[PDB]
Design a protein around this ligand. Structure first.
Ligand SMILES: NC(=O)N[C@@H](CC(=O)O)C(=O)O
Ligand SMILES: O=C1C[C@@H](C(=O)O)NC(=O)N1
Ligand SMILES: [Zn+2]
Ligand SMILES: [Zn+2]
Ligand SMILES: [Zn+2]
Ligand SMILES: [Zn+2]
Lengths: 343, 343
């Protein structure tokens, strides 16, 4: 019965993959979101303007006619990346931002960054030109417990980095901890964050109690409930430098359900409604539109979308699976109900 | 090529399942172990003398000709269990011990326990007749973080129980925490524990870093490294009330590698060599025999085995999988090179 009309949202953290997977997954984004930050961790990674242009066009090809969707491309930072390549791409309107993957921290990160020190010239060029840095903020040393890797990044990498480049704009991507939430809440106007639906809706119990649920396995790893509650309070507070970033990260069913399941939730179909439910539960729906449709554009210095969509509080059952060329794709919340759906 | 000769070991915590799965897995135990504690969590659970007698016969039917193997049966404790049935089974030599699984108010009275308080008559009967209680020591409350559930059990259930029943012999099964290692270390002669190979060899990073690994998913859940080290230190100390209990807990591959993977490591084929590897690494091979072959018997008041077994330090490959009637079974350490194997 109840209806929320919002300014059309954007997705400030998205994985679209490539080839046939891309053809399948883009419509779920393009039918709802005006723009999306398309992450660059392909194999091989997007590290040049040329690759970004070609990838952008492959994305455009797969967008149904009538969807007004623009992909905002990113550069995959590497230790040896030429600052001139980054800047050329930024100047041509190709790269909207650059993404920092610590080497081996996540999906397709074996070519990632080894030290902040090795990429200083690139980061100084980004600071100079006003290009935002998107950060997957986890340390990677093998002996550091997986649940501590986010918190340990803040003090060992993030804070030193930001002290060294005081004008650098940084998005702490997909935060999962009270540690990061506090850090961001207490930061300056040059620091922001994105938060996924899964890190708002669930904690590690939901992935591990009663059975192991690979479709909830994603990075940074789901944390203890105290952390989940901290993220929920952050978004519900109206804090205006947190915004929607799904981290929709699809893998074929049998790459999830295997002896070594890949990290990532395919939440593009259900993210917006799921976010609606969280804001509602936190009695903070007055802050919902800003999170979805205003805070991101503001941080990125981009206009807000000029169209509007409607969410209705009618219960929508989520598909058990989505067809791929080979295998199927299991949506986040598969077989489940979502409280809010798009009109 | 180094040889390690020990009195024939026993397995003080084993799942043998039933039907065709039982037929497949029993040989991996019976070729090596003289005796094993056979847990009672069948569907439906073993809660009567008659069920236990029938199950023992089915186990015996599946032992290859020549293997000298004796299953030691257990009763699953339930709200509805008649303490007379339990005592009769104990007196008739059918029940070696009784197993207490975590309480839950919603459990059916024929399939489990709603609270420890609810089954005092039966526990008093065990204390009376000198029947050992085997405890899966976790609390199940949805509000408790999965990694905290063992520690919470010690505080809220184990200690008050052992306070109310001072003559009760208790095995803290498959301990996974420093909390439990300390508790057991500091307890009296009526308190012992078993430790699995996976909880000595790995911690939660091995299950979750670089992919989700359902064949390392088991209960109690793998803990952070500080807990692993406490367990390794405990067995290496020579403390004589910890002993071998594999918790070998087989599930078909498709039940492990699913959207909701079952908890349990099938480690019967590789457990003994794995324990040898751990004791060697801890420079504690002088305590290895006692762990495998002496401590359990002493605690249960049974004789030590009179035959011997040899492990040789020659590298060997663990099978990738083991055929079942339908599907396959993936062993603990599948496809890996292993350091110690049985001659
Ligand atoms: N989050 C994930 O678990 N997976 C993402 C990578 C990322 O955002 O780190 C992916 O691309 O698969
Ligand atoms: O407590 C248990 C039960 C066992 C089983 O599968 O029977 N599996 C486990 O991992 N832990
Ligand atoms: Zn990431
Ligand atoms: Zn991502
Ligand atoms: Zn158990
Ligand atoms: Zn068990």
């Amino acid at each position: 019965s109840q209806v929320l009309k919002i300014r059309r949202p954007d997705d400030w953290h998205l994985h679209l993959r490539d080839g046939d997977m891309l053809k399948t997954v883009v419509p779920y984004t393009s039918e709802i979101y005006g723009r999306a930050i398309v992450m660059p961790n392909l194999a091989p990674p997007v590290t040049t303007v040329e690759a970004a242009v070609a990838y952008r066009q492959r994305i455009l090809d797969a967008v149904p006619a009538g969807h007004d969707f623009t992909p905002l491309m990113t550069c995959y930072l590497t230790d040896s990346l030429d600052p001139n390549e980054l800047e050329r791409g930024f100047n041509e309107g190709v790269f909207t931002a650059a993404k920092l993957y610590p080497a081996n921290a996540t999906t397709n990160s074996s070519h990632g960054v080894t030290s902040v020190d090795a990429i200083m010239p690139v980061l100084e060029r980004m600071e100079k030109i006003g290009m935002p840095l998107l950060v997957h903020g986890e340390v990677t040393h093998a002996d550091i417990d997986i649940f501590d890797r986010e918190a340990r990044f803040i003090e060992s990498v993030m804070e030193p980095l930001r002290q060294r480049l005081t004008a650098l704009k940084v998005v702490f991507e997909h935060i999962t901890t009270k540690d990061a939430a506090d850090y961001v809440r207490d930061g300056n106007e040059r620091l922001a964050a994105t938060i996924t639906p899964q890190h708002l809706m669930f904690n590690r119990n939901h992935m591990l109690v009663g059975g192991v649920r690979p479709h909830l396995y994603c990075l940074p790893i789901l944390k203890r409930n105290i952390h989940q509650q901290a993220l929920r309070e952050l978004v519900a507070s109206g804090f205006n430098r947190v915004f929607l970033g799904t981290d929709s990260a699809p893998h074929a069913r049998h790459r999830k359900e295997s002896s070594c399941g890949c990290a990532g939730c395919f939440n593009a179909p259900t993210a917006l409604g799921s976010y609606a439910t969280v804001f509602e539960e936190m009695n903070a729906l007055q802050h919902f539109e800003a999170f979805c449709s205003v805070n991101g554009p503001q941080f990125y210095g981009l206009p807000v979308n000029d169209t509007f969509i409607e969410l209705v509080r009618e219960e929508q059952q989520v598909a058990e699976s989505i067809a791929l060329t080979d295998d199927t794709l299991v949506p986040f919340l598969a077989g489940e109900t979502v409280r809010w759906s798009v009109k």
